[PDB]
Structure 1
Amino acid sequence: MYLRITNIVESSFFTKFIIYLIVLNGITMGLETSKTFMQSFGVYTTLFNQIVITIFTIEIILRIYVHRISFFKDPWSLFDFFVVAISLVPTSSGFEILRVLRVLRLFRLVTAVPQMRKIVSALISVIPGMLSVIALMTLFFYIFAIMATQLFGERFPEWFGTLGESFYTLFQVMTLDDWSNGIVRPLMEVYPYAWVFFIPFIFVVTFVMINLVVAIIVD
């Protein structure tokens, strides 16, 4: 009974059938943001959403039947599973973010449509080499998050009152977002010398990113 379906899955028609559905649901999903649309035609779309979700679930099972254990070591396939499984919990008691997460299902376009997968693959592939600098930056940020909560969090709770807040604010400055008129000049009206931790924090932070990118190019 294996042989019957295995021929169905590998067909030009199975894949193209799934892909045409995704691009369709993605067009559907666009229209789902207009509440006005959701009046005049709202009923069609909860249905369409239930149908596609059913089809995909069936479709994942056959592929596991066909691929067995070789399915759960293909990351692209694992993602489609995790992206499909996610899309199935009822949106009531569970966080209502999952009603919003189900648009991730459009990322199935990447997994099933070639060219798209490689680019993601090329990109993911620079990540393991970098994990160390990522560990560095995170330890670095953390040492500085601690310093900032203690140095400025008393008088400036919105920016530095909590360790998590300190991370964020600190993150903004690295992204160079309104950082001087916005955060430190305020800081200097009380702390004339905050530039001693924000001007160098900025140098380091800039220095590493630039050197990281450079290190990508050489490699």
Structure 2
Amino acid sequence: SHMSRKIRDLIESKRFQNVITAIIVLNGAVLGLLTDTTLSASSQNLLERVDQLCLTIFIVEISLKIYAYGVRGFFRSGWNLFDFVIVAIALMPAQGSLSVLRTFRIFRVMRLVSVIPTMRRVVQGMLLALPGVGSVAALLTVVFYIAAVMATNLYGATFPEWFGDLSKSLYTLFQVMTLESWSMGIVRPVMNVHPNAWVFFIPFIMLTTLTVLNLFIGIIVDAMAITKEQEEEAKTGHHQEPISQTLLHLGDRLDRIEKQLAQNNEL
């Protein structure tokens, strides 16, 4: 219809994006001011009303989008679903999550990512790069599990705060992989009791730092290439063809002229 089309043009405009971005920023600022314990009752009450007004603006925005695109059309996008979930969660008073309680209202500042297309493309590149590093990440997980079982059995009885159980071992091995006080804080005190403990910890460090750097580089290299392609597509409608595809078409043109020269010209 004409009306739904007039709304789609309004939603897709730069001005609408700018108003929504400004309200996300305002909402983030009021939640940031609400961390201050020294504020008066009236000051807190004022900021809480600004939070409610921001949330109402988002309800109008999402409802406006659901009508303009349709229920199936709106929920077809993962970003629209995220926008819907983030806003709808705040309207629910009794919440049943899978952790403790979603009292973190500040997570609605993540809508800056979903609303700004250049920011959206950065997160998209990162998310799309994840399956390609799955096996490297699985290898690191396997190394961690093996190491945590070994560390618990080896050092749990003599260093129970750091290695007393599997959970404690995983945590201090994560600390060890980040190189944080690994020697002065952990391994030299362990070696005072277990002089050969360096045979466990030094290969653990060498293996995990190499694997985690492989994991991070694999993510970054691929996320950068995906985002660059998505940026090209968002501006021109297409992306740059890979070097292999350019050389393929170059070879096809050479095969076409070879046939035209050997039989269609040399006869």
Class of the TM-score when normalised by the shorter of the 2 chains: 0.7 to 0.9
How many residue pairs get aligned? The number is 217
Is 1:86–1:102's contact at 8 Å kept on the other side of the alignment?
A: no
Matched, 1:98 2:102: yes
Residues 143 and 208 in structure 2, CA contact (< 8 A), matched pair in contact too: no
With over 3 angstroms needed to count, the CA separation of the structure-2 counterparts of 1:62 and 1:92, relative to structure 1, is closer
How far does the alpha carbon of each residue in 1:140-166 deviate from its partner, in whole angstroms, 9 at most, with x for none?
A: 211111111111112222111121111
Gaps of 5+ in 2: 226-267
Deviation per CA, 1:160-212: give whole Å up to 9, x if none.
11211111111011111111001111111111111111110011012223334
Contact 1:91/1:98 (<8 A) preserved: no
> C-alpha displacement at 1:129, in angstroms?
0.4
Q: Once the two structures are aligned, what percentage of the paired residues are identical?
A: 46
Cα RMSD of the aligned pairs, angstroms, is 2.6
Which of 147-156 and 5-14 deviates more? 5-14
The 5 Å alignment of 1:21-60 reads 21-39=23-41, 41-60=43-62
Give the number of the structure with larger relative contact order, counting CA–CA contacts within 8 Å between residues 6 or more apart: 2
Q: 1:148 to 1:33 in 2, by over 3 A?
A: same
- Please name the residue that 2:116 is paired with: 113
Match for 2:102: what amino acid?
L
**Partner residue in 2 for 1:142:** 145
Asked whether the equivalents of residues 87 and 98 of structure 1 are also in contact (C-alpha less than 8 Å), the reply is no
User: Following the alignment from structure 1 to structure 2, what is the Cα–Cα distance between the partners of residues 96 and 200?
Assistant: 38
Does residue 180 of structure 2 align to residue 195 of structure 1? no
The residue type paired with residue 192 of structure 2 is: E
Q: 2:3 maps to what in 1?
A: 4
Cα gap change, 1:47/1:210 in structure 2, threshold over 3 Å: closer, same or farther?
A: closer
- What is the DSSP-based 3-state SS (H/G/I as helix, E as strand, rest coil) of the residue aligned with 2:117? coil
* Length-normalised TM-score, structure 1: 0.86
Give the C-alpha shift of residue 66 in structure 1: 2.7
**Residues 160 and 194 of structure 1: CA distance in aligned 2, closer, same or farther (over 3 Å):** same
1:88 aligns with 2:87: no
How does the TM-score come out when normalised to structure 2? Answer: 0.72
Q: Compute the displacement of 1:39 (Å).
A: 4.1
From the superposition, tell whether residues 5 and 23 of structure 1 become closer, same or farther in structure 2 (CA, over 3 Å): farther
Distance 1:113 1:217 in 2: 23
